[PDB]
Amino acid sequence: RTSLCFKLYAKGKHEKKTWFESRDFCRALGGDLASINNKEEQQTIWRLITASGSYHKLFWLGLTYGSPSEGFTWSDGSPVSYENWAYGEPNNYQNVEYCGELKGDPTMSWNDINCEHLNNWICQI
């Protein structure tokens, strides 16, 4: 009753999803794509990664670009109260990168990528 819990969805290519497909999946089970709003949540997700041996994997988070006057937003509506972008990111590479992915290594860094790319994902509930 006092927290959301996180769950990794590491998938082979035949079951990977776009950002929107991943958001729809997490919402259909009663949650949303995961937001990382502070260092505590970052640590919780890193611990899940260490527990699963799911090392060096990339995962969709709930980061998505809104209108120009909103900038990057979290799908769950939470504030962008913490940022852990990789160096130079977000860079909107070739003008087509509007969704955020986690690099699931010890840096736990974020990168904007094309929303239609197939990826693993993380839900919260």
Ligand X SMILES: OC[C@H]1O[C@H](O[C@H]2[C@@H](O)[C@H](O)[C@@H](CO)O[C@@H]2O)[C@@H](O)[C@@H](O)[C@@H]1O
Residues in contact with ligand X by CB under 6 A are 58, 89, 91, 93, 97, 103, 111-113
In 3D, which of 63, 57, 34 has the Cα closest to residue 105?
57
35: contact with Ca ion by CB under 5 A: yes
Residue 84 binds to Ca ion (criterion: CB under 5 A): no
Contact of 59 with 122, CB cutoff 8 Å: yes
What does the block give as tokens for 93? 């590479």
Nearest-5° angle of CA 114, CA 11, CA 72?
30
In the complex, the smallest distance separating the C-beta of residue 104 from ligand X, rounded to whole angstroms, is 11
User: Between 40 and 116, whose beta carbon lies closer to ligand X?
Assistant: 116
Residues that bind Ca ion (CB under 5 A): 35, 37, 91, 93, 97, 111-112
